[PDB]
Amino acid sequence: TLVKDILSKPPITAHSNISIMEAAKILIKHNINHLPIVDEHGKLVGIITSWDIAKALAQNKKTIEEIMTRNVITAHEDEPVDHVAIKMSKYNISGVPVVDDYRRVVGIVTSEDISRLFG
Amino acid sequence: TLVKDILSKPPITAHSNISIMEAAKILIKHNINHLPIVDEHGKLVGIITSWDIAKALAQNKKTIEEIMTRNVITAHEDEPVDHVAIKMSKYNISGVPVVDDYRRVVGIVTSEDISRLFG
Numbered sequence: 001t002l003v004k005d006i007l008s009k010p011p012i013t014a015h016s017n018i019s020i021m022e023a024a025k026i027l028i029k030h031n032i033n034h035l036p037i038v039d040e041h042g043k044l045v046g047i048i049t050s051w052d053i054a055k056a057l058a059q060n061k062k063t064i065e066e067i068m069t070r071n072v073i074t075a076h077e078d079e080p081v082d083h084v085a086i087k088m089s090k091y092n093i094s095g096v097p098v099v100d101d102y103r104r105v106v107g108i109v110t111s112e113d114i115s116r117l118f119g
Numbered sequence: 120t121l122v123k124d125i126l127s128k129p130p131i132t133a134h135s136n137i138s139i140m141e142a143a144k145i146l147i148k149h150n151i152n153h154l155p156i157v158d159e160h161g162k163l164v165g166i167i168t169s170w171d172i173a174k175a176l177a178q179n180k181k182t183i184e185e186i187m188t189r190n191v192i193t194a195h196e197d198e199p200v201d202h203v204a205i206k207m208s209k210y211n212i213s214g215v216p217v218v219d220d221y222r223r224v225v226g227i228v229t230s231e232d233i234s235r236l237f238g
């Protein structure tokens with residue numbers, strides 16, 4: 001079971017220059033809790049969840065780039081699913097962006113996406 | 120093991136008239152993702168998570184009352200811990216406020232609390 005295999009839908013990403021409100025609107029619109037942030041060239045630079053929306057409000061930040069998590073735990077398109085599951089238990093995270101060798105975001109894998117593949 | 124036997128900290132609550140930003144500050148300060156909302160008597164009236172903070176910002180809500188979830192599953196201090204775990208699975212929830220005879224909040228049990236004891 002590789003990752004590039006189990007991807008079912010397009011990636012949803014955002015740029016870092018956007019407001020906290022715009023980011024929140026994106027989460028709600030797509031009903032997602034993980035939003036990979038890409039630069040103007042489509043390359044991964046960070047990640048946002050609803051926790052970071054709360055954190056931005058608490059720290060009085062205006063843009064996503066001031067609050068996004070910059071050390072992103074990722075999976076490779078050619079990576080095995082079990083390794084991703086272990087990554088997610090180890091770091092206690094529930095979503096990992098899937099990247100290629102050029103750092104483009106090809107999708108995202110969640111712990112619900114995985115929950116299916118084990119049960 | 121009753122609920123009262125596993126509570127390890129005081130309750131953390133907020134009033135319904137506080138701003139979205141002020142609620143967000145409470146979540147971040149205490150590193151919690153569930154915030155029971157109470158009235159002037161301390162009676163449970165709702166609950167918020169960081170997801171609700173995001174929802175509120177997206178919708179330009181001003182206070183917590185405008186976004187809080189009012190349909191809140193609870194536990195009593197004298198309820199078996201296992202019965203709380205059963206509720207979490209049954210209603211697909213991750214945080215259960217613990218209430219007393221006046222419906223005041225005396226603590227909260229989370230999914231992580233359960234996994235730490237019984238995972």
Ligand SMILES: C[S@@+](CC[C@H](N)C(=O)[O-])C[C@H]1O[C@@H](n2cnc3c(N)ncnc32)[C@H](O)[C@@H]1O
Pocket residue numbers: 033047048049050051052068069071072073074092093094095096097
């Ligand atoms: C308190 S931790 C708990 C993790 C929880 N699953 C969440 O949604 O955030 C919250 C932080 O995890 C970070 N985070 C979530 N997924 C991540 C990932 N794949 N790589 C790096 N950081 C991540 C987010 O930036 C957020 O600020």
